[PDB]
Amino acid sequence: RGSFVEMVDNLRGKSGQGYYVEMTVGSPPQTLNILVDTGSSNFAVGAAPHPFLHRYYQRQLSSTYRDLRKGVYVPYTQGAWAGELGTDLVSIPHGPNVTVRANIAAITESDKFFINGSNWEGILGLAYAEIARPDDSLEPFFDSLVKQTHVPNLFSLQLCGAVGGSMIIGGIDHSLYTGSLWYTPIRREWYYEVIIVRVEINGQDLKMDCKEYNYDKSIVDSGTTNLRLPKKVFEAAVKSIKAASSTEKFPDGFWLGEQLVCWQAGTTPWNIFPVISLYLMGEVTNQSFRITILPQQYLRPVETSQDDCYKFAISQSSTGTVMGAVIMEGFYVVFDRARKRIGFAVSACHVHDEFRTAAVEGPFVTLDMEDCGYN
Numbered sequence: 001r002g003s004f005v006e007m008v009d010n011l012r013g014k015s016g017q018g019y020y021v022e023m024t025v026g027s028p029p030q031t032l033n034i035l036v037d038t039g040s041s042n043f044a045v046g047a048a049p050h051p052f053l054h055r056y057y058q059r060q061l062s063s064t065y066r067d068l069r070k071g072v073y074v075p076y077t078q079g080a081w082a083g084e085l086g087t088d089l090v091s092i093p094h095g096p097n098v099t100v101r102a103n104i105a106a107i108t109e110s111d112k113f114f115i116n117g118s119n120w121e122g123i124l125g126l127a128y129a130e131i132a133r134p135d136d137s138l139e140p141f142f143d144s145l146v147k148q149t150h151v152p153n154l155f156s157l158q159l160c161g162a163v164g165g166s167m168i169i170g171g172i173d174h175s176l177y178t179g180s181l182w183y184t185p186i187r188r189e190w191y192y193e194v195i196i197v198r199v200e201i202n203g204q205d206l207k208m209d210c211k212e213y214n215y216d217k218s219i220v221d222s223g224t225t226n227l228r229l230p231k232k233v234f235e236a237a238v239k240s241i242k243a244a245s246s247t248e249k250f251p252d253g254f255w256l257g258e259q260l261v262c263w264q265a266g267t268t269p270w271n272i273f274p275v276i277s278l279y280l281m282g283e284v285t286n287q288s289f290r291i292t293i294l295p296q297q298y299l300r301p302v303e304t305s306q307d308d309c310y311k312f313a314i315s316q317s318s319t320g321t322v323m324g325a326v327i328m329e330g331f332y333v334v335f336d337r338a339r340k341r342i343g344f345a346v347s348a349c350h351v352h353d354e355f356r357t358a359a360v361e362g363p364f365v366t367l368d369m370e371d372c373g374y375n
């Protein structure tokens, strides 16, 4: 068995409402289910009763909790919460064998943040300090782990869609992928920002200037469900996806996520929808690689038991490209913070059919990639 076996299958998800890991806080121990989010940088836990929460953090019962005498408020693209800052002992029982004192926000009120039936009770922001609230002086959890212990500065995510997966902390487990890992640079340590240099649908280049694909940033975000694309890119990609799936027409609201379409259980005609490839900047000058997803990744099930209903989960953004769970469920993704790069390989758990699989291929030659990023 590989050396990281005890961290394999440490994530769960309930009906596609977010992937979470168990974390144990305080003394004596309180274990809670915590959503894994590479799109933010605060660690925060429900800390008062809420109708969607089975468990919450009870600070008064932890003798090692320290109050930082400061409130915090975090708004996201979806939802927001407010709470109080402090520190406490934190361990991940199916994660690294260490315990660290970390900052923790105890959430006392929230709006449209917790999700009914999702089973998670807090959020682990794995991005960098630049985007933490109240500001970049509040050390994020992964920074605490690497400063206090000798766990290598890397983690990897395998999100397994329809729900579970693995977060390997401090290394890479070779059982979780097939083929080779291909790396793209982290452009700047704030979000996990990357540069997309070409987009194809069904093998056809969308032929927009690459500056449009990264206006004003492109990021890898396990806390967002969809692949979210800037306005001009979203409109062009939908027109091309429609053109490539013209054996059937679907109501316009389906491509806006407003309508669902359902098929008799097990009969969804995946072949009528195209594959979608993103090319990413590689590690050598003028070299790129591509990651390709299937409709099984970008059509998401919505849970009669004899019907399989789906929502189209590519959507519009006014804040750049967000490579959310629709992209990450195709791949084993290695967040190699020590070497400032993100690795992709085909996931051993990605959903596919007998005709097509997700892919990571390269190298391709793409010139002037340094022009694609926003400044």
Ligand SMILES: C[C@@H](NC(=O)c1cc(C(=O)N[C@@H](Cc2ccccc2)[C@H](O)CNC2CC2)cc(N(C)S(C)(=O)=O)c1)c1ccccc1
Residues within 6 Å of the ligand: 016, 017, 018, 019, 035, 037, 038, 039, 040, 076, 077, 078, 079, 112, 113, 114, 123, 191, 219, 221, 222, 223, 224, 225, 226, 228, 315, 322, 324, 325
């Ligand atoms: C949890 C759930 N996420 C969602 O349902 C979901 C969450 C967000 C969202 O704002 N997520 C937050 C974390 C955050 C986490 C939980 C609650 C609130 C905010 C993340 O830090 C945002 N990162 C910002 C840099 C973009 C945004 C969206 N969209 C706008 S969408 C419809 O285009 O996908 C959906 C989910 C479901 C399945 C797979 C992954 C995530």
Ligand SMILES: [Cl-]
Residues within 6 Å of the ligand: 077, 078, 079, 080, 112
């Ligand atoms: Cl909202």
Ligand SMILES: [Cl-]
Residues within 6 Å of the ligand: 066, 087
């Ligand atoms: Cl402290």
Ligand SMILES: [Cl-]
Residues within 6 Å of the ligand: 095, 096, 097, 098, 151, 170
């Ligand atoms: Cl360990």
Ligand SMILES: [Cl-]
Residues within 6 Å of the ligand: 097, 098, 099, 100, 149
């Ligand atoms: Cl330790």
Ligand SMILES: [Cl-]
Residues within 6 Å of the ligand: 170, 171, 172, 173
């Ligand atoms: Cl390793």
Ligand SMILES: [Cl-]
Residues within 6 Å of the ligand: none
């Ligand atoms: Cl037009």
Ligand SMILES: [Cl-]
Residues within 6 Å of the ligand: 315
């Ligand atoms: Cl939306």
Ligand SMILES: [Cl-]
Residues within 6 Å of the ligand: 365, 366, 367, 368
């Ligand atoms: Cl070129």
